[PDB]
């Protein structure tokens, strides 16, 4: 490449992997969203919450891909594994699955940051800090807040609590 | 002092003490606010309620300090004791602690008013009546209204009631 | 905690300590401000300068506290030691004390950054760089500029210089 | 009187006396103002400062007179003694004379308040607190601030300091 400079093959490959994880996350959120749109589930605020996340995760993948090209790396795509479930249970079940997913994305971001540090690639390290690390911490905090509220509600009386959380928080 | 007139050393000292009480109240409200911002507590309206009170109490301290200087007294600061708890329980627990705190501030205001009356210091007496005494009565009434509503709710079904009060009142 | 990830107990404790330092700084600036509001000191621009800093330092403490909760740490508050003086001398005396205070805050920021680096916590490191480190460097530069100007003035003729600096710079 | 109620002859007389003191104060400020308008004094900001005070003191007398009639008392006017000086010296001399005058007005307000308290006349007591006592404390603080600044300046180099204070404060 005529532009590549200080960009390791290790980081290049890791970035491609991270693109796959983001796209798979988007796919998972797509499935979550449409499950809550089912006539026999019918929680519109929950559907909207996960559809917005599907967009955000796709957007993150696209930002990674733009950066790959800015650095002179080469995007390589792999298959996208289907989401881990076909049906997602209740709101708390779904929100727990979402936090699990985000923690995994965050760990991948942290791993990539560590790799960039090891490879003395400050551009990468700054890119992740500026566009990804704080967004993850903010989102996971929001999810934990939501889980706490849902749990306080669905302890009391489950269907009622699920409805109220969807109406009054989401 | 070239300006001091009809301002007793007794009042001057009492005002400094009252500044400390207001600042400590602000500090307590800061702690209350951030506790309700915890991911495992997550009651945003409660957090906002106490953060607003932290501001109000700091503002009261500043007004007292401005008055001290207007009268030719000298501000003296003491250490600020940490708040009485590190964790604040449920919404009713917190609101009860807040009413306890405000009653103590109100009694200090009443004590200072009595001192000003005894010292024949009408400026002080007017200052407290105009900026502090009615604000306290209004705030304590609001807190009592809140406590009554919370209690009516958390009798019924506790988690549900706590959520509803936060969503629909705060 | 359901959200905590890559957040060391060491950093958590250090953040709580740093909150205390910021709050104590705010308190010091409050005292500085009101001293310059005394009828026998009466330098309104100096009063305004330190009152603005009191706000800024309180704001920094609040940002730290928000971050503590975003990461799943637990805010713990300690007593706030009273400021180191009850009277603050002349403008240069005050500005020197302020630079001393800010250097100490900056060193605490630098220490915490080093700890985050050691603990491989890039979110923390980015947070400090983005919200605190440059703000400190900018403020300390401003203070050094001020000290240089004050010193050039109060060499010449002290009272006159103090008045002019307050009128024409602050 | 068909309206008079709870209004003592003692207060009525004291109010008339206080009107005289306010009018005499206004007269003094008129003289101060025009002295600083002399071509051989020529401090326009000082002239403006005292002319504004002359207006304020006349306004206070008029408010007292309105209140006298609201209560069913009878305004009685006495001669207005000429001001205590024909020439007022330097800015600090003038400002000291002004503080002396205001302290005397404030003491008269305090005396009248005490009389109203003794006579169980809350309307009077409220009237003075609301329209006069805080205005005096604010004005005397402003004068003390001014005196402190003037003194810091005219120590250094007198004519220069007098000019600068007039240009940059007034």
XYZ file of C-alpha atoms in Angstrom:
680
model
C 0.000 0.000 0.000
C 1.119 3.511 -0.863
C -0.366 4.947 2.384
C 0.089 2.267 5.029
C 2.299 3.393 7.908
C 2.677 1.995 11.417
C -0.276 -0.324 10.817
C 0.437 -3.901 11.886
C -0.939 -7.002 10.231
C -2.057 -8.036 13.725
C -4.212 -4.905 14.134
C -5.510 -5.180 10.544
C -6.760 -8.748 11.232
C -8.184 -7.809 14.674
C -10.115 -4.914 13.079
C -11.674 -7.324 10.539
C -12.662 -9.624 13.370
C -14.172 -6.719 15.303
C -16.204 -5.736 12.207
C -17.657 -9.256 12.200
C -18.523 -9.000 15.920
C -20.282 -5.644 15.363
C -22.223 -6.944 12.378
C -23.233 -10.035 14.333
C -24.348 -7.777 17.189
C -26.435 -5.736 14.758
C -27.986 -8.985 13.468
C -28.781 -10.102 17.029
C -30.444 -6.753 17.721
C -32.468 -7.061 14.515
C -33.790 -10.406 15.759
C -34.500 -8.968 19.233
C -36.371 -6.059 17.722
C -38.613 -8.134 15.505
C -39.357 -10.615 18.290
C -40.781 -7.730 20.414
C -42.876 -6.719 17.331
C -44.667 -10.134 17.387
C -48.397 -9.881 17.993
C -48.014 -12.327 20.922
C -45.197 -10.220 22.507
C -46.223 -6.684 21.460
C -43.878 -4.401 23.418
C -43.287 -1.529 21.026
C -40.829 0.394 23.211
C -38.667 -2.735 23.566
C -38.799 -3.309 19.811
C -37.694 0.304 19.250
C -34.868 0.017 21.813
C -33.293 -2.950 20.067
C -33.879 -1.668 16.526
C -31.983 1.524 17.463
C -29.146 -0.684 18.777
C -29.085 -2.672 15.555
C -28.501 0.610 13.695
C -25.804 1.726 16.157
C -23.878 -1.553 15.851
C -24.025 -1.480 12.034
C -22.778 2.105 12.185
C -19.857 1.034 14.388
C -18.913 -1.681 11.884
C -18.966 0.906 9.091
C -16.725 3.281 11.092
C -14.238 0.439 11.639
C -14.271 -0.336 7.924
C -13.670 3.332 7.035
C -10.736 3.346 9.428
C -9.337 0.104 7.989
C -9.224 1.795 4.578
C -7.866 5.093 6.004
C -4.923 3.095 7.369
C -4.346 1.075 4.202
C -5.580 -2.212 5.573
C -7.921 -4.470 3.647
C -11.417 -5.261 4.723
C -12.139 -8.986 4.711
C -15.589 -10.244 5.504
C -16.649 -13.551 6.963
C -19.936 -15.237 7.376
C -22.336 -13.770 9.941
C -23.479 -16.355 12.386
C -27.152 -16.225 13.139
C -28.149 -14.949 16.560
C -27.932 -17.261 19.505
C -31.718 -17.535 20.002
C -34.828 -17.500 17.767
C -37.105 -16.347 20.663
C -35.973 -13.983 23.374
C -38.324 -14.513 26.335
C -39.390 -11.631 28.545
C -37.976 -8.069 28.670
C -35.502 -8.923 31.498
C -34.324 -12.008 29.566
C -33.688 -9.833 26.501
C -31.971 -7.043 28.422
C -29.687 -9.599 30.140
C -28.756 -11.050 26.745
C -28.051 -7.519 25.512
C -25.706 -6.753 28.444
C -23.889 -10.078 27.826
C -23.477 -9.076 24.157
C -22.231 -5.575 24.980
C -19.762 -6.833 27.582
C -18.334 -9.124 24.891
C -18.030 -6.210 22.432
C -16.424 -4.085 25.132
C -13.892 -6.793 25.926
C -13.054 -7.059 22.211
C -12.541 -3.253 22.126
C -10.305 -3.507 25.232
C -8.354 -6.394 23.676
C -7.826 -4.412 20.449
C -6.727 -1.352 22.464
C -4.165 -3.518 24.297
C -2.917 -4.835 20.954
C -2.574 -1.289 19.579
C -0.667 -0.265 22.715
C 1.647 -3.303 22.360
C 2.171 -2.406 18.620
C 2.773 1.309 19.459
C -0.160 2.423 17.246
C -1.505 5.589 18.876
C -3.861 6.392 16.020
C -5.732 3.112 16.655
C -5.742 3.649 20.363
C -7.189 7.162 19.981
C -9.756 6.006 17.406
C -11.156 3.381 19.818
C -11.177 5.732 22.784
C -12.879 8.533 20.849
C -15.548 6.483 19.030
C -16.173 3.228 20.905
C -14.940 2.858 24.489
C -17.098 5.644 26.029
C -20.097 4.749 23.899
C -19.874 1.211 25.332
C -19.539 2.334 28.921
C -22.545 4.669 28.506
C -24.694 1.995 26.859
C -23.864 -0.693 29.410
C -24.703 1.737 32.262
C -28.077 2.452 30.581
C -28.741 -1.271 30.265
C -27.852 -1.914 33.893
C -30.205 0.938 34.938
C -32.907 -0.644 32.796
C -32.326 -4.147 34.177
C -32.521 -2.809 37.744
C -35.844 -1.082 36.987
C -37.319 -4.063 35.165
C -36.313 -6.375 38.027
C -37.919 -4.064 40.631
C -41.120 -4.210 38.561
C -41.375 -7.823 37.504
C -40.730 -8.963 41.047
C -43.916 -7.124 42.137
C -46.320 -8.545 39.405
C -44.688 -9.638 36.141
C -47.039 -8.745 33.270
C -48.028 -5.492 34.871
C -44.362 -4.584 35.450
C -43.356 -5.431 31.896
C -46.124 -3.216 30.510
C -45.332 -0.301 32.803
C -41.583 -0.374 32.010
C -42.314 -0.360 28.295
C -44.823 2.492 28.604
C -43.081 4.680 31.098
C -39.335 4.161 30.468
C -39.013 3.103 26.856
C -14.638 47.371 60.361
C -15.517 50.658 58.702
C -19.087 49.471 57.893
C -20.138 47.242 60.777
C -23.160 48.581 62.653
C -25.579 46.829 64.996
C -24.016 43.477 64.114
C -23.248 41.373 67.184
C -20.351 38.978 67.536
C -22.962 36.408 68.588
C -24.850 36.737 65.280
C -21.586 36.809 63.283
C -20.529 33.452 64.823
C -24.034 31.930 64.429
C -24.041 32.916 60.731
C -20.696 31.115 60.222
C -22.121 28.051 61.913
C -25.230 28.199 59.729
C -23.012 28.390 56.611
C -21.370 25.144 57.736
C -24.785 23.493 58.254
C -25.921 24.556 54.755
C -22.717 23.333 53.140
C -22.997 20.036 54.996
C -26.604 19.755 53.810
C -25.474 20.361 50.235
C -22.832 17.632 50.679
C -25.456 15.215 52.034
C -27.686 15.938 49.040
C -24.759 15.354 46.682
C -24.299 11.906 48.226
C -28.054 11.193 48.045
C -28.139 12.202 44.409
C -25.253 10.028 43.322
C -26.545 7.036 45.281
C -29.812 7.171 43.237
C -27.620 7.331 40.061
C -26.090 3.893 40.905
C -26.822 1.230 38.312
C -28.235 -0.993 41.099
C -30.569 1.810 42.356
C -31.343 3.662 39.097
C -34.099 6.124 40.040
C -33.340 9.128 37.868
C -36.123 11.369 39.191
C -34.908 10.799 42.767
C -31.332 11.556 41.724
C -32.526 14.800 40.098
C -34.587 15.781 43.168
C -31.612 15.578 45.500
C -29.114 17.120 43.071
C -31.410 20.170 42.783
C -31.462 20.347 46.606
C -27.682 20.174 46.752
C -27.585 23.262 44.508
C -30.225 25.071 46.591
C -28.363 24.453 49.863
C -25.040 25.629 48.391
C -26.843 28.725 47.130
C -28.215 29.393 50.623
C -24.705 29.150 52.089
C -23.471 31.651 49.498
C -26.311 34.084 50.325
C -25.394 33.862 54.023
C -21.757 34.549 53.187
C -22.698 37.579 51.054
C -24.750 38.880 53.958
C -21.919 38.281 56.441
C -19.713 40.531 54.301
C -22.502 43.112 53.736
C -22.696 43.481 57.524
C -18.938 43.633 58.074
C -18.615 40.243 59.689
C -15.900 37.789 58.745
C -16.546 34.479 57.123
C -14.787 31.620 58.890
C -14.963 28.139 57.488
C -14.704 24.831 59.270
C -14.338 21.316 58.115
C -17.342 19.725 56.401
C -18.296 16.496 58.022
C -19.097 13.748 55.598
C -22.735 12.747 55.293
C -24.228 10.487 57.886
C -24.616 7.487 55.540
C -22.730 6.042 52.536
C -25.874 4.231 51.217
C -29.357 5.647 51.511
C -31.762 2.699 51.194
C -35.096 3.057 49.436
C -36.863 6.263 48.299
C -38.896 6.552 51.559
C -35.709 6.056 53.617
C -34.027 8.869 51.671
C -37.004 11.221 51.846
C -37.257 10.659 55.629
C -33.562 11.494 56.002
C -34.133 14.621 53.911
C -37.028 15.809 56.122
C -34.872 15.186 59.235
C -32.107 17.296 57.641
C -34.463 20.121 56.663
C -36.106 20.223 60.090
C -32.622 20.650 61.575
C -31.829 23.501 59.151
C -35.180 25.102 59.924
C -34.544 24.917 63.657
C -31.129 26.540 63.126
C -32.845 29.334 61.128
C -35.412 29.745 63.947
C -32.635 29.797 66.562
C -30.720 32.463 64.603
C -33.920 34.521 64.205
C -34.455 34.364 67.986
C -30.861 35.490 68.521
C -31.322 38.418 66.113
C -34.529 39.395 67.926
C -32.729 39.218 71.308
C -29.849 41.363 69.833
C -32.333 43.864 68.273
C -30.975 43.218 64.741
C -33.937 43.746 62.410
C -31.852 43.517 59.255
C -30.897 39.921 60.159
C -34.417 39.055 61.108
C -35.774 40.380 57.794
C -33.014 38.675 55.789
C -33.924 35.249 57.241
C -37.650 35.763 56.813
C -37.308 36.961 53.216
C -34.792 34.372 51.949
C -34.915 31.269 54.152
C -37.869 30.745 56.496
C -40.591 30.489 53.790
C -38.354 28.500 51.471
C -37.936 25.956 54.297
C -41.621 25.743 55.090
C -42.425 25.236 51.381
C -39.753 22.565 50.925
C -40.710 20.626 54.047
C -44.389 20.650 52.950
C -43.319 19.269 49.534
C -41.291 16.549 51.237
C -44.163 15.597 53.519
C -46.483 15.405 50.463
C -43.904 13.195 48.773
C -43.450 10.943 51.813
C -47.228 10.499 52.090
C -47.449 9.495 48.410
C -44.464 7.161 48.560
C -45.869 5.483 51.684
C -49.290 4.971 50.030
C -47.465 3.294 47.130
C -44.829 1.171 48.799
C -47.396 -0.240 51.184
C -49.293 -1.673 48.173
C -46.266 -3.381 46.391
C -42.840 -1.869 47.088
C -40.784 -2.032 43.877
C -43.755 -1.189 41.735
C -44.617 1.780 43.980
C -41.065 3.101 43.981
C -40.952 3.000 40.177
C -44.335 4.659 39.747
C -43.523 7.510 42.178
C -40.274 8.205 40.362
C -41.949 8.141 36.940
C -45.144 9.944 37.699
C -44.265 12.458 40.457
C -40.576 13.182 40.082
C -21.976 -5.009 40.014
C -23.825 -6.052 36.882
C -21.942 -3.478 34.728
C -18.435 -3.269 36.158
C -15.761 -4.321 33.671
C -12.025 -3.653 33.641
C -12.424 -1.258 36.567
C -9.876 -1.879 39.319
C -10.469 -1.379 43.013
C -7.291 0.725 42.957
C -8.751 3.148 40.386
C -12.142 3.181 42.160
C -10.459 4.285 45.432
C -8.191 6.825 43.652
C -11.257 8.365 41.955
C -12.949 8.807 45.365
C -9.817 10.468 46.673
C -9.677 12.760 43.643
C -13.329 13.749 44.242
C -12.330 14.823 47.755
C -9.397 16.870 46.391
C -11.688 18.624 43.873
C -14.315 19.374 46.501
C -11.644 20.704 48.844
C -10.330 22.871 46.002
C -13.834 24.216 45.411
C -14.094 24.988 49.147
C -10.738 26.802 49.078
C -11.904 28.872 46.109
C -15.139 29.709 47.925
C -13.075 31.083 50.813
C -10.786 33.000 48.421
C -13.768 34.513 46.671
C -15.492 35.731 49.799
C -12.264 37.132 51.239
C -11.925 39.404 48.142
C -15.594 40.459 48.724
C -14.671 41.880 52.188
C -15.240 45.612 52.496
C -11.596 46.001 53.627
C -10.283 44.038 50.575
C -12.880 44.956 47.917
C -11.436 43.574 44.669
C -14.517 42.479 42.763
C -12.702 41.033 39.742
C -10.570 38.852 42.042
C -13.675 37.708 43.913
C -15.303 36.784 40.583
C -12.182 34.931 39.375
C -12.116 32.634 42.383
C -15.890 32.140 42.573
C -15.825 30.924 38.943
C -13.035 28.496 39.927
C -15.059 27.226 42.864
C -17.837 26.343 40.399
C -15.395 24.696 37.970
C -13.846 22.510 40.686
C -17.266 21.413 41.990
C -18.220 20.585 38.408
C -15.078 18.461 38.023
C -15.947 16.532 41.194
C -19.439 15.888 39.821
C -18.023 14.625 36.494
C -15.749 12.224 38.399
C -18.712 10.983 40.419
C -20.786 10.433 37.256
C -17.904 8.448 35.811
C -17.507 6.393 38.998
C -21.142 5.318 38.627
C -20.833 4.776 34.837
C -18.053 2.281 35.590
C -19.878 0.540 38.433
C -17.702 1.876 41.206
C -19.126 3.268 44.419
C -18.805 6.845 45.470
C -17.532 7.212 49.025
C -17.262 10.615 50.593
C -14.955 11.814 53.318
C -14.805 14.904 55.378
C -13.778 18.121 53.620
C -10.913 19.779 55.356
C -11.289 23.494 55.714
C -9.058 25.652 53.547
C -5.498 26.214 54.583
C -5.968 29.919 55.423
C -8.779 32.124 56.803
C -7.304 35.307 55.191
C -5.556 35.318 51.850
C -3.378 38.452 51.770
C -2.865 40.414 48.573
C -3.788 39.418 44.987
C -0.303 37.936 44.275
C -0.461 35.942 47.537
C -3.844 34.527 46.497
C -2.802 33.766 42.924
C 0.331 31.961 44.197
C -1.825 29.859 46.528
C -4.117 29.087 43.590
C -1.218 27.895 41.387
C 0.045 25.707 44.277
C -3.463 24.208 44.566
C -3.795 23.594 40.825
C -0.349 22.009 40.564
C -1.421 19.599 43.315
C -4.654 18.755 41.453
C -2.694 18.296 38.238
C -0.245 15.945 39.924
C -3.177 13.925 41.302
C -4.622 13.730 37.750
C -1.195 12.612 36.439
C -0.893 10.029 39.231
C -4.371 8.647 38.446
C -3.520 8.521 34.719
C -0.365 6.524 35.538
C -2.443 4.152 37.665
C -4.964 3.676 34.836
C -2.105 2.984 32.414
C -0.592 0.437 34.850
C -4.091 -1.198 35.237
C -4.666 -1.185 31.425
C -7.836 0.951 31.775
C -8.022 3.011 28.579
C -11.479 4.368 29.324
C -10.124 6.065 32.477
C -7.083 7.325 30.686
C -9.199 8.856 27.900
C -11.691 10.340 30.379
C -8.908 12.226 32.215
C -7.241 13.405 29.027
C -10.507 14.611 27.490
C -12.006 16.363 30.542
C -9.238 17.292 32.985
C -5.614 17.265 31.816
C -5.944 20.031 29.163
C -8.265 22.089 31.335
C -5.544 22.051 34.022
C -2.748 22.996 31.667
C -4.844 25.887 30.284
C -5.807 27.153 33.742
C -2.278 26.977 35.135
C -0.963 28.897 32.082
C -3.626 31.588 32.698
C -2.606 31.802 36.348
C 1.072 32.091 35.482
C 0.228 34.884 32.982
C -1.750 36.601 35.727
C 1.007 36.212 38.327
C 3.556 37.667 35.891
C 1.316 40.694 35.248
C 0.502 41.244 38.911
C 4.202 41.035 39.817
C 5.141 43.587 37.114
C 2.522 45.917 38.619
C 2.959 45.513 42.346
C 6.695 45.963 42.013
C 6.068 49.471 40.593
C 3.589 50.729 43.336
C 1.593 48.040 45.152
C -1.912 49.395 45.819
C -2.061 51.117 42.481
C -0.930 47.928 40.708
C -3.445 45.754 42.528
C -6.283 48.095 41.548
C -5.212 48.336 37.918
C -4.874 44.541 37.507
C -8.337 44.022 38.945
C -9.869 46.723 36.736
C -8.080 46.075 33.509
C -7.423 42.298 33.448
C -10.088 40.733 35.619
C -58.636 60.469 61.703
C -61.134 58.092 60.144
C -58.374 55.607 59.137
C -55.760 55.764 61.881
C -55.306 52.447 63.680
C -52.453 51.190 65.845
C -50.382 54.233 64.895
C -48.771 55.900 67.907
C -48.124 59.600 68.285
C -44.540 58.606 69.120
C -44.070 56.861 65.751
C -45.871 59.685 63.898
C -43.407 62.253 65.344
C -40.365 59.985 64.741
C -41.423 59.547 61.089
C -41.561 63.352 60.650
C -38.104 63.622 62.153
C -36.806 60.892 59.848
C -38.252 62.768 56.837
C -36.199 65.794 57.898
C -33.040 63.654 58.204
C -33.590 62.197 54.706
C -34.219 65.609 53.179
C -31.123 66.984 54.887
C -29.149 64.021 53.539
C -30.438 64.755 50.042
C -29.368 68.400 50.487
C -25.894 67.314 51.631
C -25.576 65.071 48.577
C -26.662 67.936 46.323
C -23.821 70.032 47.744
C -21.343 67.140 47.375
C -22.378 66.622 43.783
C -21.997 70.226 42.732
C -18.654 70.570 44.511
C -17.258 67.708 42.338
C -18.667 69.578 39.267
C -16.408 72.608 40.035
C -13.885 73.347 37.307
C -11.101 73.189 39.940
C -12.292 69.746 41.210
C -13.692 68.204 37.998
C -14.395 64.572 38.923
C -17.495 63.762 36.908
C -17.972 60.211 38.202
C -17.883 61.488 41.800
C -20.379 64.224 40.941
C -22.682 61.595 39.398
C -22.331 59.269 42.416
C -23.506 61.909 44.861
C -26.223 63.342 42.605
C -27.734 59.833 42.343
C -27.646 59.637 46.165
C -29.372 62.994 46.464
C -32.217 61.571 44.353
C -32.349 58.346 46.394
C -32.559 60.214 49.714
C -35.315 62.528 48.433
C -37.166 59.439 47.223
C -36.863 57.860 50.679
C -38.321 60.997 52.282
C -41.244 60.857 49.848
C -41.888 57.169 50.652
C -41.945 58.013 54.373
C -44.399 60.832 53.721
C -46.670 58.538 51.675
C -46.610 56.063 54.540
C -47.364 58.773 57.113
C -50.530 59.594 55.162
C -51.405 55.898 54.585
C -51.414 55.483 58.372
C -53.387 58.652 59.087
C -50.524 60.600 60.576
C -49.808 64.193 59.649
C -46.714 65.314 57.868
C -45.017 68.238 59.591
C -41.997 69.849 58.043
C -39.164 71.698 59.699
C -36.371 73.791 58.419
C -33.593 72.013 56.516
C -30.233 72.775 57.964
C -27.593 73.495 55.398
C -24.931 70.850 54.899
C -22.085 70.644 57.332
C -19.429 71.846 54.852
C -19.287 74.252 51.875
C -16.228 72.456 50.352
C -15.701 68.727 50.556
C -11.970 68.124 50.018
C -10.717 65.087 48.136
C -12.674 61.973 47.056
C -11.727 60.013 50.236
C -12.771 62.987 52.405
C -16.152 63.070 50.648
C -16.694 59.314 50.792
C -15.868 59.313 54.535
C -18.411 62.089 55.098
C -20.949 60.066 53.112
C -20.410 56.929 55.245
C -20.771 59.056 58.419
C -24.064 60.422 57.031
C -25.388 56.986 56.069
C -24.465 55.455 59.425
C -26.487 58.235 61.071
C -29.485 57.535 58.801
C -29.157 53.821 59.496
C -29.104 54.403 63.241
C -32.240 56.557 62.922
C -33.914 53.707 60.967
C -32.832 51.232 63.690
C -34.113 53.569 66.420
C -37.485 53.925 64.653
C -37.692 50.133 64.203
C -37.078 49.686 67.950
C -39.813 52.226 68.681
C -42.251 50.403 66.376
C -41.396 47.108 68.090
C -41.950 48.699 71.536
C -45.324 50.145 70.272
C -46.338 46.769 68.711
C -46.655 48.326 65.216
C -45.766 45.536 62.784
C -46.785 47.508 59.714
C -44.099 50.117 60.511
C -41.542 47.486 61.275
C -42.198 45.703 57.963
C -42.211 48.980 56.009
C -38.712 49.880 57.281
C -37.324 46.404 56.716
C -38.733 46.161 53.190
C -37.819 49.654 51.926
C -34.949 51.063 53.994
C -32.891 48.728 56.188
C -31.466 46.544 53.361
C -30.990 49.513 51.060
C -28.839 51.100 53.795
C -26.773 48.003 54.423
C -26.143 47.621 50.665
C -25.189 51.278 50.215
C -22.859 51.367 53.213
C -21.108 48.188 51.963
C -20.639 49.860 48.543
C -19.201 52.947 50.218
C -16.817 50.899 52.336
C -15.667 49.037 49.179
C -15.135 52.403 47.512
C -13.242 53.871 50.474
C -10.959 50.818 50.573
C -10.188 51.188 46.850
C -9.647 54.937 47.030
C -7.320 54.508 50.023
C -5.265 51.829 48.205
C -4.887 54.295 45.319
C -4.271 57.612 47.011
C -1.636 56.055 49.226
C 0.380 55.178 46.082
C 0.249 58.683 44.363
C -2.728 60.882 45.264
C -3.792 62.797 42.139
C -3.162 59.838 39.909
C -5.174 57.570 42.234
C -8.087 59.986 42.440
C -8.270 60.197 38.643
C -8.044 56.445 38.137
C -10.778 55.683 40.714
C -13.100 58.179 39.067
C -12.402 56.817 35.577
C -12.328 53.136 36.272
C -14.785 52.595 39.165
C -17.271 55.433 38.976
